[PDB]
Structure formats: structure tokens, C-alpha cells
Amino acid sequence: KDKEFQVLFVLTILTLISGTIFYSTVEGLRPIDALYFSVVTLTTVGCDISPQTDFGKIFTILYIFIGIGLVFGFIHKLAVNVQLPSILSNLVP
Amino acid sequence: KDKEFQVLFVLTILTLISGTIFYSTVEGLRPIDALYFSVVTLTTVGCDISPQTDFGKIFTILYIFIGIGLVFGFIHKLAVNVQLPSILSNLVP
Amino acid sequence: KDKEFQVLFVLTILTLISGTIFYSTVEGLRPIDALYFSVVTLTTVGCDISPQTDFGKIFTILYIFIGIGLVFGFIHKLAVNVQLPSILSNLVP
Amino acid sequence: KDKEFQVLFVLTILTLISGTIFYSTVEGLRPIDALYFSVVTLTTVGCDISPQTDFGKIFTILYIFIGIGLVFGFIHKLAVNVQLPSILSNLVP
Ligand code: NA
Ligand code: NA
Ligand SMILES: [Rb+]
Ligand SMILES: [Rb+]
Structure with a gap:
């Protein structure tokens, strides 16, 4: 319940941090843009700009399939x- | 049932209204284009054009994760x- | 079962036909490109090109929410x- | 369980291989870019570049609906x- 939601939150945060580091260093994007990507x-959802580095594409495939x-569970x-x-609480009279 | 669907409908409407206001004022898009975004x-689904303002990207991340x-439940x-x-009714003989 | 799958198939076909007609006439796209959209x-999945006509955007919103x-059920x-x-059958010895 | 996951993995691998062959030969993309697509x-997720060949669009529709x-089950x-x-194991004390 609570611990489950918190564990999922921390896992998603770490995954997003890893992706941001990758796309900001290897790809060369800005930190907030890497987080958005x-x-x-x-x-x-998707984005207009796509990766260009082959290593970037490999990491993107693995990152999708891993995260x-x-x-979505989070x-x-x-x-x-x-x-x-x-x-439910804010709809109670 | 009925009340559940109506509550989800109103919640989605308010969320879309908030997003439209944001993207029409801060980002600077037209109201219908902001609603489409x-x-x-x-x-x-996605779009060709992406946000550009850092505040816009922060709101986009939070908006996705919140809505x-x-x-999808709606x-x-x-x-x-x-x-x-x-x-089922329109398929009845 | 069988009838359910067939009904879903026909419904999806009719929905796609409606969307294709719309995007080929109003928007002005080619039939196969409208079907792809x-x-x-x-x-x-998404696409690179987006609608431009306001009527097109209204129909796109309603079409997403309706189809x-x-x-996905289909x-x-x-x-x-x-x-x-x-x-299962093609994996039987 | 294990066999189910492995069968899904091999099926996804073969489907991705078929798509890569298609998009690298017919469409004319590079192998890694075809795999990313x-x-x-x-x-x-989506991509910025879209198919252009009518055969490509037909295969894309069928490929989506088939894979x-x-x-997602995989x-x-x-x-x-x-x-x-x-x-669960790496969270055990
Ligand atoms: Na462009
Ligand atoms: Na684009
Ligand atoms: Rb999607
Ligand atoms: Rb998408």
C-alpha cells in the first residue's frame, strides 16, 4: 500500500534520473529537456526530436522496455x- | 456507475481546462490548439510541436503524471x- | 467470443472508415495517409504531421475519446x- | 511462467526482426534506426519521421495491430x- 507506492515512486525517480544523466551527457541535451524526454x-506520450547517437538508440530501446x-505501474x-x-474525501459532505 | 462516470467526466473536463489555460497563457498557444495539446x-497520442518554456516542461511532466x-480511467x-x-442495445433484434 | 471479436473488428473498421473519410475530405489528405493517421x-502511436483545421482538431479530440x-479492446x-x-497450436508437438 | 516469458521474448524478438528487415530494405533506413522505429x-512511444511508401504504411498498420x-503483454x-x-529480493534485509 503506502510502502508499495513509495517504492514505486523512488524507483521511477531513479530511472528518470538515470535517463536524464544519459541524455544530458551522451546525447548532449539540457537537464530539464533530458528529463522531459x-x-x-x-x-x-512522445516528442518531436529523436535520438541520433546509436548508443542513444540502444539505450532508448532498453530504457523503454525496462521502464x-x-x-505505468506507478x-x-x-x-x-x-x-x-x-x-473520495474531497467529495464527502 | 452513472455518478462514477459523471465524476470522471467532470474531473477530466477540469483537468483539460487547466491545461488549456496554462498552454494558452504561459506557452502562448491558441485555446483550441492548447486543448488539442x-x-x-x-x-x-502525441503532437509534432513540443513545449519550450522550462515552466512549461515542468507543468507537462506533472500534468502527465497527474492526469x-x-x-484513461475515464x-x-x-x-x-x-x-x-x-x-448491446443497438445490436438487439 | 467469436461474435465478440467480429463485432469489435467491424466497429473498428467503421470507425477507421469514418476517420479516413474525414481526414481525406476536410483535412485534404490522401486516403491511405488518412487511414494511417x-x-x-x-x-x-502518433504521427509527425498534425491537424490544422479547427474542425479537424475538434473531430480529433472526439475521435480519440470515442475510439x-x-x-484497444479490439x-x-x-x-x-x-x-x-x-x-498455442503452433507450439504443440 | 518462465516458459511463458521466454516465448513472449522470442516472439517479440522475431516481430522486431521482421519490422527491422522491412524498414531497412523497403523503406531504406539503417538497421538500428529501423529497430528503433x-x-x-x-x-x-512514437517517432519524428514517418513512413512514406504506401506499402510501408500498410505494413505499419498491420504491424501495429499485430504486435x-x-x-505490451511481454x-x-x-x-x-x-x-x-x-x-523484492534486492529489497530484502
Ligand atoms: Na520539421
Ligand atoms: Na516532427
Ligand atoms: Rb502512446
Ligand atoms: Rb505516442
Whole structure:
């Protein structure tokens, strides 16, 4: 429950940090832009600009396959154990 | 059931309104284009043009993580409690 | 089962046909390109080119919200009742 | 369990190989770029560049509809039977 959500949160944070480091150093992007790219790639939203370095593409494939499940599980647990109870409470008379 | 679908609908509407206000004022887009961006970002479809303001990127990350679960739950409930019964009725002899 | 998959298939086909007609007439795209746009939008994959007509954007929002659930349910049923049994049979000794 | 995950892995690998061959020969892309395109299309992440050949678009539609279910099932099973036990073990005192 609580510990599960917190573990998922920390795991997603570390994964996003790794992706940001990668895309800011290897690819050469700015830190916030690298974070945006990581989020949009792990959330399947997408971006206009794409990687160019072959190492970047390899890491992108592995990163998707490694972190999509984690990010989407974190979203599911955030909606089921954080957003839903909050809405239920703020909808009580 | 009905109240659940309506609550999800109103929540999605308010979230989309917030996103539209943000992207139309801060980013500087037109209202309908801001609504399209919000929908495509919360639905994971995507867009060709991306945010440019750092504040915009921060809000985009938080907006995705806050509204993807809501939008997709609304889609699920719309398909299970609105689309499915309608199809079943219009498929009855 | 079978009838469910077939109904989902026909519904997805009609939805894609409607989207193709729209994007080929109003937007002004070629039929196959309109079909590709409809598929990539209902499947959340994405595209490089985006709508430009305000009517196009309205229809895109409504089309996403109306057909994402249908397309993804069709994919789920195709994987559970068509792909999975086929793989099980072709994996039998 | 184990055999299920391995079968899904091999199926995804073969599907990605087919997509890479297609996009590297017909479309004319480089092998790693074709693999990236296949991954981003089957994972619904997206890409900046889109197909141009009509045959390419037909194959893209069929490829999405044929492999999205497989790729996402592989991701689900990888998260439930590989990532989750590993995290549980590395979180044990
Ligand atoms: Na361009
Ligand atoms: Na683009
Ligand atoms: Rb997506
Ligand atoms: Rb996408």
C-alpha cells in the first residue's frame, strides 16, 4: 500500500534520473529537456526530436522496455491509492 | 456507475481546462490548439510541436503524471458503462 | 467470443472508415495517409504531421475519446482469442 | 511462467526482426534506426519521421495491430515475473 507506492515512486525517480544523466551527457541535451524526454518516452506520450547517437538508440530501446512497466505501474498505484481516496474525501459532505 | 462516470467526466473536463489555460497563457498557444495539446498529451497520442518554456516542461511532466490515470480511467468507464450498453442495445433484434 | 471479436473488428473498421473519410475530405489528405493517421491516433502511436483545421482538431479530440477504448479492446480480444490460441497450436508437438 | 516469458521474448524478438528487415530494405533506413522505429511503433512511444511508401504504411498498420498486444503483454510479464521478484529480493534485509 503506502510502502508499495513509495517504492514505486523512488524507483521511477531513479530511472528518470538515470535517463536524464544519459541524455544530458551522451546525447548532449539540457537537464530539464533530458528529463522531459525521459518522461515522454517512459509515458509513451512522445516528442518531436529523436535520438541520433546509436548508443542513444540502444539505450532508448532498453530504457523503454525496462521502464514502461515501472512508470505505468506507478501511475496505476498513484491513481488507485492516492488520487482516488483524495477524490473520495474531497467529495464527502 | 452513472455518478462514477459523471465524476470522471467532470474531473477530466477540469483537468483539460487547466491545461488549456496554462498552454494558452504561459506557452502562448491558441485555446483550441492548447486543448488539442492537452488531449494528445493526456491520451499519450502525441503532437509534432513540443513545449519550450522550462515552466512549461515542468507543468507537462506533472500534468502527465497527474492526469494520465484520470483520462484513461475515464476512457475505460466510458467504454464499459456507456459505449458497451449502447452497442448491446443497438445490436438487439 | 467469436461474435465478440467480429463485432469489435467491424466497429473498428467503421470507425477507421469514418476517420479516413474525414481526414481525406476536410483535412485534404490522401486516403491511405488518412487511414494511417486514424490508426496512429486511435492506437496512440502518433504521427509527425498534425491537424490544422479547427474542425479537424475538434473531430480529433472526439475521435480519440470515442475510439481509443474500442481499438484497444479490439487489440486485447485479438490477442486473447486469436493470437494466443494460434500460438498455442503452433507450439504443440 | 518462465516458459511463458521466454516465448513472449522470442516472439517479440522475431516481430522486431521482421519490422527491422522491412524498414531497412523497403523503406531504406539503417538497421538500428529501423529497430528503433519498430520499437517506438510497437511500444506506442512514437517517432519524428514517418513512413512514406504506401506499402510501408500498410505494413505499419498491420504491424501495429499485430504486435502491440504482443509487445505490451511481454512488458507486463517482464514486470510481473522478472522485475517484481528481482526488486523484492534486492529489497530484502
Ligand atoms: Na520539421
Ligand atoms: Na516532427
Ligand atoms: Rb502512446
Ligand atoms: Rb505516442
